[PDB]
Write a protein that binds this DNA or RNA. Sequence first.
RNA 1: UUUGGACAAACUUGGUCAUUUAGAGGAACUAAGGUUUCCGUAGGUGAACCUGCGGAAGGAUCAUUAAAGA
Length: 180
Amino acid sequence: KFESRKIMVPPHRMTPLRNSWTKIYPPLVEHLKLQVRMNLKTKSVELRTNPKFTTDPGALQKGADFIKAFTLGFDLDDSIALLRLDDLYIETFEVKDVKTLTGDHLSRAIGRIAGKDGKTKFAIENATRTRIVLADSKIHILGGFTHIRMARESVVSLILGSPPGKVYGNLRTVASRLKE
RNA sequence: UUUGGACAAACUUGGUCAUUUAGAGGAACUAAGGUUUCCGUAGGUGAACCUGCGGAAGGAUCAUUAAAGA
Protein backbone atom coordinates (compact mmCIF):
# COMPACT_ATOMS: atom_id res chain seq x y z
CA LYS A 1 0.00 0.00 0.00
CA PHE A 2 3.02 2.23 0.53
CA GLU A 3 6.77 1.98 0.15
CA SER A 4 9.46 4.61 -0.17
CA ARG A 5 13.18 5.25 -0.40
CA LYS A 6 15.02 8.28 0.97
CA ILE A 7 18.45 9.17 -0.43
CA MET A 8 20.88 11.91 0.53
CA VAL A 9 22.79 14.43 -1.58
CA PRO A 10 26.26 15.53 -0.41
CA PRO A 11 26.84 19.28 -0.29
CA HIS A 12 29.07 19.75 -3.34
CA ARG A 13 26.36 18.14 -5.48
CA MET A 14 23.59 20.24 -3.92
CA THR A 15 23.86 23.23 -6.24
CA PRO A 16 23.94 21.22 -9.51
CA LEU A 17 20.74 19.55 -8.35
CA ARG A 18 18.89 22.83 -7.74
CA ASN A 19 19.92 24.09 -11.16
CA SER A 20 18.57 20.88 -12.73
CA TRP A 21 15.54 20.21 -10.52
CA THR A 22 12.96 21.15 -13.16
CA LYS A 23 14.58 18.69 -15.57
CA ILE A 24 14.62 15.53 -13.44
CA TYR A 25 11.22 15.25 -11.83
CA PRO A 26 9.06 15.29 -15.02
CA PRO A 27 10.67 12.05 -16.27
CA LEU A 28 10.04 10.36 -12.91
CA VAL A 29 6.46 11.49 -12.37
CA GLU A 30 5.35 10.95 -15.97
CA HIS A 31 7.21 7.89 -17.20
CA LEU A 32 7.52 5.97 -13.92
CA LYS A 33 4.39 7.42 -12.27
CA LEU A 34 6.26 7.71 -8.98
CA GLN A 35 5.71 10.66 -6.68
CA VAL A 36 8.63 12.70 -5.38
CA ARG A 37 9.58 15.69 -3.30
CA MET A 38 12.75 17.49 -2.29
CA ASN A 39 13.00 17.64 1.50
CA LEU A 40 15.31 20.56 2.20
CA LYS A 41 14.97 20.03 5.97
CA THR A 42 17.47 17.17 5.64
CA LYS A 43 19.10 17.73 2.24
CA SER A 44 17.50 14.59 0.82
CA VAL A 45 15.08 13.51 -1.88
CA GLU A 46 12.25 11.08 -1.27
CA LEU A 47 10.58 8.72 -3.75
CA ARG A 48 7.18 7.28 -2.89
CA THR A 49 4.94 4.72 -4.62
CA ASN A 50 1.16 4.88 -4.89
CA PRO A 51 -0.29 1.40 -5.52
CA LYS A 52 -3.30 2.69 -7.45
CA PHE A 53 -1.54 3.92 -10.60
CA THR A 54 1.81 2.09 -10.85
CA THR A 55 2.74 -0.60 -13.35
CA ASP A 56 5.26 -3.04 -11.90
CA PRO A 57 7.61 -3.45 -8.93
CA GLY A 58 10.71 -2.50 -10.91
CA ALA A 59 9.78 1.18 -11.09
CA LEU A 60 10.90 2.11 -7.58
CA GLN A 61 14.42 0.70 -7.96
CA LYS A 62 14.98 2.42 -11.31
CA GLY A 63 14.12 5.79 -9.80
CA ALA A 64 16.49 5.43 -6.87
CA ASP A 65 19.35 4.20 -9.05
CA PHE A 66 18.89 7.15 -11.40
CA ILE A 67 19.15 9.62 -8.53
CA LYS A 68 21.98 7.65 -6.94
CA ALA A 69 24.09 7.98 -10.08
CA PHE A 70 23.56 11.73 -10.09
CA THR A 71 24.97 12.23 -6.59
CA LEU A 72 28.08 10.27 -7.56
CA GLY A 73 28.63 13.01 -10.14
CA PHE A 74 27.65 11.54 -13.50
CA ASP A 75 26.19 13.91 -16.07
CA LEU A 76 22.41 14.20 -16.18
CA ASP A 77 22.18 12.73 -19.68
CA ASP A 78 24.38 9.83 -18.56
CA SER A 79 22.23 9.10 -15.52
CA ILE A 80 19.07 9.14 -17.63
CA ALA A 81 20.17 5.89 -19.28
CA LEU A 82 19.26 4.11 -16.05
CA LEU A 83 15.58 4.88 -16.67
CA ARG A 84 15.72 3.69 -20.29
CA LEU A 85 18.03 0.65 -20.32
CA ASP A 86 17.97 -2.36 -18.03
CA ASP A 87 21.47 -3.85 -17.54
CA LEU A 88 23.71 -0.96 -16.46
CA TYR A 89 25.77 -1.13 -13.27
CA ILE A 90 28.16 1.05 -11.28
CA GLU A 91 31.53 -0.07 -9.93
CA THR A 92 33.79 1.92 -7.61
CA PHE A 93 37.13 1.61 -5.82
CA GLU A 94 39.91 3.81 -4.50
CA VAL A 95 43.59 3.87 -5.39
CA LYS A 96 44.74 2.82 -1.92
CA ASP A 97 43.08 -0.53 -2.63
CA VAL A 98 45.60 -1.16 -5.39
CA LYS A 99 48.82 0.35 -4.04
CA THR A 100 49.60 2.36 -0.93
CA LEU A 101 51.01 5.71 -2.06
CA THR A 102 50.75 8.96 -0.23
CA GLY A 103 52.11 12.38 -1.18
CA ASP A 104 53.10 13.72 -4.58
CA HIS A 105 53.06 10.07 -5.63
CA LEU A 106 49.30 10.15 -5.08
CA SER A 107 48.77 13.35 -7.06
CA ARG A 108 50.89 12.15 -9.98
CA ALA A 109 48.92 8.91 -10.11
CA ILE A 110 45.52 10.47 -10.75
CA GLY A 111 47.09 12.93 -13.16
CA ARG A 112 48.30 9.89 -15.08
CA ILE A 113 44.72 8.64 -15.49
CA ALA A 114 43.29 11.91 -16.78
CA GLY A 115 46.23 12.72 -19.01
CA LYS A 116 46.88 16.09 -20.60
CA ASP A 117 43.59 17.83 -21.43
CA GLY A 118 41.78 14.74 -20.20
CA LYS A 119 42.72 12.96 -23.41
CA THR A 120 43.75 9.71 -21.70
CA LYS A 121 40.47 9.37 -19.80
CA PHE A 122 38.56 10.20 -22.98
CA ALA A 123 40.39 7.39 -24.78
CA ILE A 124 39.40 4.75 -22.23
CA GLU A 125 35.73 5.71 -22.43
CA ASN A 126 35.83 5.13 -26.19
CA ALA A 127 37.61 1.78 -26.46
CA THR A 128 35.18 0.52 -23.82
CA ARG A 129 31.64 1.88 -24.00
CA THR A 130 31.54 3.31 -20.50
CA ARG A 131 31.55 6.52 -18.46
CA ILE A 132 34.19 7.37 -15.84
CA VAL A 133 34.38 9.99 -13.08
CA LEU A 134 37.36 10.77 -10.85
CA ALA A 135 36.39 12.21 -7.47
CA ASP A 136 39.82 12.75 -5.90
CA SER A 137 41.02 9.31 -4.79
CA LYS A 138 37.84 7.40 -5.76
CA ILE A 139 36.97 6.09 -9.23
CA HIS A 140 33.45 5.24 -10.41
CA ILE A 141 32.76 3.33 -13.64
CA LEU A 142 29.31 3.04 -15.23
CA GLY A 143 28.49 0.54 -17.96
CA GLY A 144 27.68 -3.03 -18.88
CA PHE A 145 29.12 -5.83 -16.79
CA THR A 146 31.73 -7.10 -19.21
CA HIS A 147 32.66 -3.60 -20.38
CA ILE A 148 33.28 -2.51 -16.78
CA ARG A 149 35.92 -5.18 -16.28
CA MET A 150 37.76 -4.19 -19.45
CA ALA A 151 37.88 -0.62 -18.18
CA ARG A 152 39.00 -1.57 -14.68
CA GLU A 153 41.95 -3.69 -15.75
CA SER A 154 43.42 -0.79 -17.72
CA VAL A 155 42.92 2.02 -15.23
CA VAL A 156 44.61 -0.27 -12.70
CA SER A 157 47.76 -0.57 -14.78
CA LEU A 158 48.11 3.21 -14.93
CA ILE A 159 48.11 3.53 -11.15
CA LEU A 160 50.64 0.72 -10.92
CA GLY A 161 52.85 3.02 -12.98
CA SER A 162 52.94 1.81 -16.59
CA PRO A 163 53.59 4.57 -19.13
CA PRO A 164 50.55 5.87 -21.02
CA GLY A 165 51.99 4.89 -24.40
CA LYS A 166 51.92 1.21 -23.51
CA VAL A 167 48.27 1.44 -22.50
CA TYR A 168 47.06 2.97 -25.76
CA GLY A 169 48.38 -0.10 -27.55
CA ASN A 170 46.34 -2.42 -25.34
CA LEU A 171 43.16 -0.46 -26.03
CA ARG A 172 43.65 -1.12 -29.75
CA THR A 173 43.72 -4.87 -29.13
CA VAL A 174 40.55 -4.91 -27.03
CA ALA A 175 38.67 -2.83 -29.60
CA SER A 176 39.42 -5.26 -32.44
CA ARG A 177 38.24 -8.24 -30.38
CA LEU A 178 34.86 -6.58 -29.88
CA LYS A 179 34.65 -6.34 -33.67
CA GLU A 180 35.60 -10.02 -34.21
C1' U B 1 162.32 -0.80 21.30
C1' U B 2 158.24 0.08 25.12
C1' U B 3 153.57 1.55 29.24
C1' G B 4 148.95 4.23 29.29
C1' G B 5 145.32 7.69 26.68
C1' A B 6 142.34 10.33 23.25
C1' C B 7 141.34 10.32 17.84
C1' A B 8 139.78 6.33 14.80
C1' A B 9 140.27 3.84 9.34
C1' A B 10 138.76 -1.13 9.02
C1' C B 11 137.98 -6.65 10.05
C1' U B 12 135.24 -11.27 11.68
C1' U B 13 130.53 -13.96 13.25
C1' G B 14 125.18 -13.79 13.77
C1' G B 15 120.13 -10.97 12.73
C1' U B 16 117.14 -7.91 9.47
C1' C B 17 115.63 -4.94 5.22
C1' A B 18 116.49 -3.63 0.01
C1' U B 19 118.69 -4.60 -4.79
C1' U B 20 121.58 -7.03 -9.08
C1' U B 21 122.40 -11.63 -11.51
C1' A B 22 122.71 -17.18 -12.96
C1' G B 23 118.39 -19.75 -12.50
C1' A B 24 115.20 -23.77 -11.59
C1' G B 25 110.36 -25.11 -11.47
C1' G B 26 105.38 -24.04 -12.01
C1' A B 27 100.44 -21.23 -11.92
C1' A B 28 101.24 -19.79 -16.13
C1' C B 29 98.25 -15.79 -18.18
C1' U B 30 97.51 -13.14 -22.78
C1' A B 31 97.97 -12.75 -28.10
C1' A B 32 97.88 -15.32 -32.81
C1' G B 33 66.40 -10.30 -24.54
C1' G B 34 64.06 -6.11 -20.66
C1' U B 35 59.56 -1.95 -20.89
C1' U B 36 57.95 3.13 -15.67
C1' U B 37 63.25 4.99 -14.63
C1' C B 38 66.32 5.00 -10.27
C1' C B 39 68.82 5.17 -4.67
C1' G B 40 70.35 2.46 0.07
C1' U B 41 70.38 -2.48 2.24
C1' A B 42 69.73 -7.96 2.49
C1' G B 43 68.99 -12.58 -0.21
C1' G B 44 68.67 -15.62 -4.89
C1' U B 45 70.04 -17.51 -10.48
C1' G B 46 75.27 -20.19 -15.10
C1' A B 47 72.86 -15.55 -16.86
C1' A B 48 70.59 -8.78 -17.96
C1' C B 49 65.96 -10.70 -16.66
C1' C B 50 64.03 -12.19 -9.79
C1' U B 51 62.23 -11.05 -4.36
C1' G B 52 61.63 -8.35 0.78
C1' C B 53 61.71 -3.09 3.45
C1' G B 54 62.23 2.33 3.29
C1' G B 55 62.96 6.71 -0.21
C1' A B 56 62.82 10.03 -5.20
C1' A B 57 60.37 12.03 -10.24
C1' G B 58 65.20 13.20 -13.10
C1' G B 59 56.69 10.83 -14.80
C1' A B 60 51.19 13.79 -18.83
C1' U B 61 45.20 17.44 -13.90
C1' C B 62 39.72 16.13 -17.02
C1' A B 63 35.20 17.61 -14.43
C1' U B 64 32.54 19.77 -9.96
C1' U B 65 31.79 23.15 -5.08
C1' A B 66 29.44 29.64 -1.40
C1' A B 67 26.42 34.23 -3.31
C1' A B 68 23.19 39.62 0.22
C1' G B 69 17.38 44.41 1.47
C1' A B 70 13.65 44.43 8.53
